[PDB]
Amino acid sequence: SYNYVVTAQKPTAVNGCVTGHFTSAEDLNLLIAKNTRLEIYVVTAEGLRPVKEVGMYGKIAVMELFRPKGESKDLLFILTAKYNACILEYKQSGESIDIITRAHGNVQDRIGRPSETGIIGIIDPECRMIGLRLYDGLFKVIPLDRDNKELKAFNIRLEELHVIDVKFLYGCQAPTICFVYQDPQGRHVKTYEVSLREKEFNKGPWKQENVEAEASMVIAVPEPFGGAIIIGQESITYHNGDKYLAIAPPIIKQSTIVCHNRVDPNGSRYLLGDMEGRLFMLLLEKEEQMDGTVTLKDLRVELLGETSIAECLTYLDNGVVFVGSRLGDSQLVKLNVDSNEQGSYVVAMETFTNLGPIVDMCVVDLERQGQGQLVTCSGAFKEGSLRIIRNGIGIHEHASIDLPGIKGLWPLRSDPNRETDDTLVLSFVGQTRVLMLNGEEVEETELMGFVDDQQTFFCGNVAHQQLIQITSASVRLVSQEPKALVSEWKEPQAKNISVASCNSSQVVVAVGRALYYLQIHPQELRQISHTEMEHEVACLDITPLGDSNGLSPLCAIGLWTDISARILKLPSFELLHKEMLGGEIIPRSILMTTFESSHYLLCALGDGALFYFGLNIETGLLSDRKKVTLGTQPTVLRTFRSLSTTNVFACSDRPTVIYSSNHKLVFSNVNLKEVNYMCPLNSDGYPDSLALANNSTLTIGTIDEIQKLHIRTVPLYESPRKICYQEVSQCFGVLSSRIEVQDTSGGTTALRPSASTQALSSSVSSSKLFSSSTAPHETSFGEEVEVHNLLIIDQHTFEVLHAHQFLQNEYALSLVSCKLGKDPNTYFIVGTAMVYPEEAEPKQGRIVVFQYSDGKLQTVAEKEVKGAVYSMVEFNGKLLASINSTVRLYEWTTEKELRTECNHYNNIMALYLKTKGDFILVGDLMRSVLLLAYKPMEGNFEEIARDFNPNWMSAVEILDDDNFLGAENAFNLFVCQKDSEERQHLQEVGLFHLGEFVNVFCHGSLVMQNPTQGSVLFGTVNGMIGLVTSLSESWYNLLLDMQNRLNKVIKSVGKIEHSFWRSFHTERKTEPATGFIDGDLIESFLDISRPKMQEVVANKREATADDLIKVVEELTRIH
Amino acid sequence: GTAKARYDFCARDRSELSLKEGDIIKILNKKGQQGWWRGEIYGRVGWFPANYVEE
Amino acid sequence: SCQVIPVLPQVMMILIPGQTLPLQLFHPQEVSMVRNLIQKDRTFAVLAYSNVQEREAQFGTTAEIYAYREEQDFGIEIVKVKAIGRQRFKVLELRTQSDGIQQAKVQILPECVLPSTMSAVQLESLNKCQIFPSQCSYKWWQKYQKRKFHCANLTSWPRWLYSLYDAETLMDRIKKQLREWDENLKDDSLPSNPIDFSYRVAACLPIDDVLRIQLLKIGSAIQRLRCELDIMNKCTSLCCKQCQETEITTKNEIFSLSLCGPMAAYVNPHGYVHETLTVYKACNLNLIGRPSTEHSWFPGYAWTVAQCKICASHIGWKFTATKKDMSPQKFWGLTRSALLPTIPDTEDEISPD
Ligand SMILES: [Zn+2]
């Protein structure tokens, strides 16, 4: 087996969000838990400033902030799915950020049955203890003191077993806990006092009280009100011993309330969210009782507006609320004083992409660009969507002037009054051409005082309203307004300029080994410094940074012999840090630049290597040497902002944008074959565009959003289920299901317009293959009826061309696009099942063959089957399908019909169907993997092997005829090999705790492809897209050693060792990780410091640190 | 153990032995109320009363 | 774990955990063996024979003796013993001792349990809304499925599909079939634990030896509940084991006169186990002899031997009331050891999971 698995897209679904002061006592923070990731932000008037993002070795189950005695800022408590408790402290020392572990420990019991309502963790107001509820009838308490480092906690025997929700009650003498529990009698609210000394539950403040049969939420009300609020389906009650206030408003019965958050510290207002995606305001009215303390007057509920389906909510400040969603896009909303015409105080501000739940997906090379694209069935209910994900950063080309051999580009402004650029100077071999930009027109013009028979190295707008031009012959200065040469510096011995660089106010040129520092002043260029170097100059840069914003105090340079990057002071040339470089290749380019706040020195070489180091603007010394290869030809480094952030463009064989995110440099490729030179441009006809140039053509065009992976969202406003592509018709087939309420008039009416209703063409599945007398339709008013549908969405515009609705109670479960038999037409075949609420098992279903012709989906064939069709696949020109526990193979006859060719009756339900050649891997929801094979001479199926281990299963895929990848219970991945003697059983050869629930596997890759065997992408419920590629044993054996060596040096968050986290876990079985390599762990080898690499790479084949750099870099190219 | 059958006894379940007077039954067990004893006639094995058969 | 546990020779039953094994031993060699099992508090084994002629077994259950009743009579010291199955096992070796009693080398099979299918999808979503108390049955089941399986839409399968694998829904589906036969409440009679519920159903279902062997081979309680429903829904006909095409009774005629399930374990005065199933009607059976009341398992009702119409094999007995005040007036007590659950039409035995 031996498989390698890496994350192509991090999980996007939000499962927890809190507000506090984690970074600083003054900074209001927002922490977000994206499953195995933690995001840290700061609340500002604009929005959220990203500060840090860390990789947690576990699914974050609980996330809470607290500040005990003798603590300047909030500490973060986090508990993972594998019960790993931790107290994390934020510590920023200068421009470097670090998350350190104050205390850590595993709180998993020896023997315990996990509770039905998951894990519930809560903290006491005075930060005296942490109350966890991991198992049924057992309430664990961690003693919060400045001494418990290992987190040794005690378990208490709780008589109540079925506890729904529990919160530490505010305003109490001792640490009290309020909770709602269920028993055979009914749901009730109870209180207990938690004593650390005695370790037992003493009587609480008030007696046990009865609550609604559908009451399932507890809110710890802070001072001065106190007590708790119990939310249910119809009633909302308050409990403070003596007082029992209750209201049943009609505005809340439409949907179940699922989340809550506090707005005021006192607790006068609370935001509530429901399943239908509504936002409400729960107002605790306060009566002014003259005895100091106040009493609750009445509870009032108000509808604010419509938001995404929120798992958790959080009020930030000034009406700004963050909406953390699991189903749809997480969003940032604003609550206004005055509501809009529709009557909604909620107004969206920003939308954060969420690809999950990825229920289905396919790989299609949509633009035939060589690189594949991924279209996914994302979201559910009103949050239904289709997302197209592709690697790289696009370039929207507008101009295309054929000018071969350009050796430099520079934007210019001939007129000072205009802020926009109207000139673009191009350099050529021994010559310089100048172009004019009158809108979209480009004409060859001559700028005064600019020599044209010499090759230019730099030119542009400079201080005192002047223009500069550094040529092989000499440096020129032209007065912008009268257009004339005013000053010209020449070399004393009439020598040519070898290398040169200039900025807004300074000019630094070099002739072989000589160097001359010049300054820009009205009509003059005066030489200040004159220094000779050890060897000939290779490259130069003088980009100023945010030290003083005027003239740069430091300068970067490179040498021909004894290659090294050096930093120099301008009024003297003092050698600050001489970082020596290795190899027999000279640095072609060098650049100083700012990124977020920290400054960096980037140095490129002829072999395509790029070094980057942190550089302090006052001291002038380098730090953290990190090397990375991008291309094979020399790289050119230029700067551009585009969307309010400085970015660097690296022109080479593999052009790439070096940008920053999470205070570290990111290297995302641009979708262009080759760029030799480029510059940013901002003309009237080309606003905020980029001027790229290659071996043959000058091109002007707008860049895409600067980020790894470009995602396009198509909203449907209904749940998508399956997707397949039909190349002949240039469109996708998508199964969908809107929810229509049962009308009193005897019909259906949607809650909102969606893709299936708002379509160009629509049709109903008028058919009588199912008789009317099957099951009596006894659904009352307001019942949720699921109206299934098939959409013919276009592949270029993604517009819904057709929406064929199925029959009443019909459920579409499978869909394929293929040519069957000797028929040249490609069809859309759908497997359905008749689901009547009264019937438990589906005894009816059908298979419909469709043909999208003349803009209308025609029905070709309709085969009724006695059972549900869960999966179908194309098998050697014959349609293979699954009816309940029967794997049937159909033949497409000349009279366009599906005749039954062969049958195979199995003692397991057929949910999954995958094929490779003549092999058929069937599967079940209870991990019943079964490999069958169709012998053509026999004319029927034959079992080869099986492995029926009882375990939940979500997806399956065939890597090759022997290896079979699959996803199983408690977020794990497994592989089944075939030993083709004993052949009738599959050998399990892979175990790996992924931490994500895989809904779908799909063969393909998102790389251009102009090292590893095979390529399988996977879509998870948390919006994470992963990749599995199989590898050799020699390569596995090497990378397995790297896994053990990297764990010794990488400082894990919460000190959780990698071996335990990625090891298999299904409660009863907890085996180590085998037959799998965590690619994300391997990829972090480049992120560690240079001395750490020497410790990792400690010990024919020799270890060498640089050798393993190329192997790890090769593995990053597969995703 | 010879033991000859003297009166016809029809079996009421799969545990009792269907008998016809004349045959000798090899006595396997000889303990029970009303002389109910276990026996085998080569193939079939089952119980029978003493007031029907004789030693 | 591994244990060399002893095996009784007279046992011919396929015992299921929780099911009671009645016994009546005449031989003093097995009586003394039973009494040693009392003092040492050890458990004996019940080998589920595939080929009972040459004594061949691959699986079984460890039975613990829970009752002993020495009845020192004039003839011989006759003993009556009740035992209960506890743990399922795999047979590794059959060590036949010089005393004619075999000591099977046993490997205890683990009781495989699985959590809620929705808990494996997400951790904190829809946790508060999961278990609910106790308006009509239709409205409770429609909202229970929509509220418990709300996470199902996040996966590649519908709500109703996961209902076919949920232990609570499968148990309730079985309870609806059981209530049609027996007029008893689940409250205390039937257990709430899916493991105990599955084994309780397995013991009281009228099924042949091979179905019980395959049912005992099942490890997960979820799979066992699904297989039990497949038998109830597909095998709606019971036929003679000898001639396999003689329809005797159907599912819709099963009832419980005794308030101890539809098919209970009874024993005749000769020490033989008869798992009698009570049915209102039973076609294709010949009645032999006169109606007797000697050692009547159902007092008041008179039994008459009921043999097959074709092969004349003993199938059961016809029970008719003597007093007119009784209700019902007639029923048939059919023995499990002679009934083959046949799927009607022309399809052979098949059962998903
Ligand atoms: Zn018969």
* Per-domain boundaries in chain A: 1-13+355-391+709-1030, 14-354, 392-708, 1031-1119
Cβ of C76 within 8 Å of Cβ of B13? The answer is no
Residue C284 alpha carbon to ligand 1 centre in Å: 9
Cβ of C314 within 8 Å of Cβ of B12? The answer is yes
Q: Are C165 and C152 in contact (CB under 8 A)?
A: no
Superfamily for A14-354?
YVTN repeat-like/Quinoprotein amine dehydrogenase (2.130.10.10)
Rounded to 5 degrees, φ, ψ at C221 are -65, -30
Rounded to 5 degrees, φ, ψ at A999 are -90, -25
| Separation between Cα atoms, residue A973 and residue A359, nearest integer Å | 17
DSSP-derived secondary structure letter, A1046? H
The set of chains that have 3 or more CB pairs under 8 A with C is A, B
Cβ of A182 within 8 Å of Cβ of C133? The answer is yes
Cβ of A117 within 8 Å of Cβ of C130? The answer is yes
Chain C residue numbers touching B31 (CB-CB < 8 A): 26, 75-76
SS3 A375: strand
Contacts of A176 (CB under 8 A, 6+ apart): A168, A169, A191, A192, A193, A194, A204, A205
Pairing of strands A346-352, A330-335: antiparallel
In this structure, whether the domain defined by C247-341 belongs to CATH 3.40.718.10 is answered with no
| Separation between Cα atoms, residue C241 and residue C341, nearest integer Å | 9
Residue type present at position A904: H
B45 touches chain C (CB under 8 A): no
Chain A residue numbers touching C217 (CB-CB < 8 A): none
Right CATH number for A1031-1119 from 3.50.50.60, 2.70.98.10, 2.40.30.110, 1.10.150.910? Answer: 1.10.150.910
B18 touches chain C (CB under 8 A): no
Q: Do domains A14-354 and A392-708 have the same CATH topology?
A: yes
CA nearest A483: which of A444, A435, A433, A449? A449
Class of residue A818 by CB neighbours under 10 A (exposed 0-12, middle 13-18, buried 19+): middle
Min Cα separation B31/chain C (Å): 7
Residue type present at position C248: I
Contacts of A636 (CB under 8 A, 6+ apart): A588, A589, A604, A650, A651, A652, A676, A677, A678
| Separation between Cα atoms, residue A991 and residue A925, nearest integer Å | 18
Resolution of the model in angstroms: 3.4
Residue C283 alpha carbon to ligand 1 centre in Å: 12
Cβ of B13 within 8 Å of Cβ of C272? The answer is yes
Q: Which CATH architecture group holds C158-234?
A: Up-down Bundle (1.20)
Right CATH number for A392-708 from 3.40.50.720, 2.60.40.10, 3.30.565.10, 2.130.10.10? Answer: 2.130.10.10
Instruction: Give the C-alpha distances (Å, rounded to integers) separating A843 from A770, A833, A849, A866.
Output: 11, 8, 21, 6
| Separation between Cα atoms, residue A1118 and residue A1115, nearest integer Å | 6
Residue B42 alpha carbon to ligand 1 centre in Å: 24
| Separation between Cα atoms, residue A895 and residue A69, nearest integer Å | 83
Cβ of C76 within 8 Å of Cβ of B31? The answer is yes
The C339-341 sheet, strands edge to edge: C247-250, C237-240, C339-341
Right CATH number for A1-13+355-391+709-1030 from 2.130.10.10, 1.20.1440.80, 3.30.1330.10, 3.30.460.80? Answer: 2.130.10.10
| Separation between Cα atoms, residue C239 and residue C245, nearest integer Å | 7
Pairing of strands C263-267, C247-250: unpaired
Choose the closest CB to A840 out of C119, C122, C173. Answer: C173
Chain-centroid distance of CA A117 in Å reads: 28
User: Best residue in B27, B33, B37, B48 to probe C by mutation, most C CBs within 10 Å?
Assistant: B33
In this structure, whether the domain defined by C2-108 belongs to CATH 3.40.1280.10 is answered with no
Q: Are A397 and A668 in contact (CB under 8 A)?
A: no
Chains A and B touch (3+ CB pairs under 8 A): no
Which neighbouring-strand residues pair with A322?
A: A314, A332
**Contact pairs from chain B to chain C, CB under 8 Å:** 38
Cβ of C26 within 8 Å of Cβ of B15? The answer is no
C269 touches chain B (CB under 8 A): yes
Q: What residue ranges define each of the domains in chain B, with the CATH number in brackets?
A: 4-54 (2.30.30.40)
Instruction: Give the relative orientation of helices C221-234 and C167-181 as an angle to the nearest 10 degrees.
Output: 40
Residue C316 alpha carbon to ligand 1 centre in Å: 12
Min Cα separation B52/chain C (Å): 16
The A912-916 sheet, strands edge to edge: A912-916, A919-923, A928-935, A940-948
Q: Are B17 and B41 in contact (CB under 8 A)?
A: yes
Closest alpha carbon within chain B to C79? B32
Q: Provide the experimental method for this PDB entry.
A: X-ray
| Separation between Cα atoms, residue A369 and residue A391, nearest integer Å | 12
Rounded to 5 degrees, φ, ψ at A233 are -70, -45
Chain A residue numbers touching C223 (CB-CB < 8 A): 926, 950
Residue type present at position A828: F
User: Best residue in A780, A870, A1000, A1021 to probe C by mutation, most C CBs within 10 Å?
Assistant: A1021
Whether the CA torsion A445, A447, A451, A456 is positive or negative: it is negative
Q: Are A12 and A34 in contact (CB under 8 A)?
A: yes
Q: Are A959 and A1016 in contact (CB under 8 A)?
A: yes
CA nearest A681: which of A641, A721, A719? A641
CA nearest A967: which of A831, A1064, A1069? A1064
| Helices first, then strands: H and E counts in chain A | 5, 88
Cα Rg of chain A (Å, integer): 34
Q: Are C99 and C107 in contact (CB under 8 A)?
A: no
Cβ of B15 within 8 Å of Cβ of C270? The answer is yes
CA nearest A38: which of A66, A59, A68, A23? A59
The set of chains that have 3 or more CB pairs under 8 A with B is C
Q: How many residues does chain B have?
A: 55
Cβ of B31 within 8 Å of Cβ of C26? The answer is yes
Residue C338 alpha carbon to ligand 1 centre in Å: 9
Cβ of C157 within 8 Å of Cβ of A380? The answer is no
| Separation between Cα atoms, residue A237 and residue A247, nearest integer Å | 7
**Contact pairs from chain A to chain C, CB under 8 Å:** 148
Every domain of chain C and the residues it spans: 2-108, 158-234, 247-341
C110 touches chain B (CB under 8 A): no
